Amino acid sequence: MNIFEMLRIDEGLRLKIYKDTEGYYTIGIGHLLTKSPSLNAAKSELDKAINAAKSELDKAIGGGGGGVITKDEAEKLFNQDVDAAVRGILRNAKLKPVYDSLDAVRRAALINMVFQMGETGVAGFTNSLRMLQQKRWDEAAVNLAKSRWYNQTPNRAKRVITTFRTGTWDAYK
């Protein structure tokens, strides 16, 4: 078990455009395409996030609103998304210290959250954060469970919380 395996569990691996838990068009391992309630815009965004990587340097690659993706391709986006989330943590005044104090397993729980709701979204967890910092596992678990994050995505939050509470991979086993 590891952060990649964790997010693959929690996000799945879909090679065809799908919708998030908010109804938004997404692809790969939880890569948001657009908030527009339009499949067309999605493709458009997809055919822009796909050719963008190895776009200009050399010959073409496709250029066609198919809506499907290559595992490797999904992988790439996945690797960028995770890198982004990690750097959002490090760059965040509030998330950084909490992260710094955490152990490897709890660290991916933090990444996991950042990856799901964004840097600012996680940083707004004033209590939970301070408790994580103080190593008050039980207390932080309880607070997080009282959030709207948990409310909307219970299954996932529980897993995440179990990870914060125990410091083990039990929930993903």
Curated annotation (Swiss-Prot):
Induction and repression of expression: Expressed late in the viral replication.
GO cellular component, one term: host cell cytoplasm
EC number in record: 3.2.1.17
Active-site residues, record numbering mapped to chain: 11, 20
SUPFAM superfamilies linked to this entry: Lysozyme-like
Any one Gene Ontology molecular-function term assigned to this protein's record: lysozyme activity
Catalytic activity: Hydrolysis of (1->4)-beta-linkages between N-acetylmuramic acid and N-acetyl-D-glucosamine residues in a peptidoglycan and between N-acetyl-D-glucosamine residues in chitodextrins
Outcome (variant: residue 128 to V): 50-fold decrease in enzymatic activity
One BP term from GO: defense response to bacterium
InterPro entries the UniProt entry points to: Endolysin_T4_type, Glyco_hydro_24, Lysozyme-like_dom_sf, Lysozyme_dom_sf, Phage_lysozyme-like, T4-type_lysozyme
pH curve summary: Optimum pH is 7.3.
Annotated effect of mutating residue 30 to A: Almost complete loss of enzymatic activity
Effect of substituting residue 30 to F: Almost complete loss of enzymatic activity. The enzyme is destabilized by 1.5 kcal/mol
Keywords: Antimicrobial, Bacteriolytic enzyme, Cytolysis, Glycosidase, Host cell lysis by virus, Host cytoplasm, Hydrolase, Viral release from host cell
Family: Belongs to the glycosyl hydrolase 24 family.
Function (record text): Endolysin with lysozyme activity that degrades host peptidoglycans and participates with the holin and spanin proteins in the sequential events which lead to the programmed host cell lysis releasing the mature viral particles. Once the holin has permeabilized the host cell membrane, the endolysin can reach the periplasm and break down the peptidoglycan layer.
UniProt-listed HAMAP family: ENDOLYSIN_T4
Stated name of the protein: Endolysin
Organism: Enterobacteria phage T4
Organism taxonomic ancestry: Viruses, Duplodnaviria, Heunggongvirae, Uroviricota, Caudoviricetes
GN (gene name): E
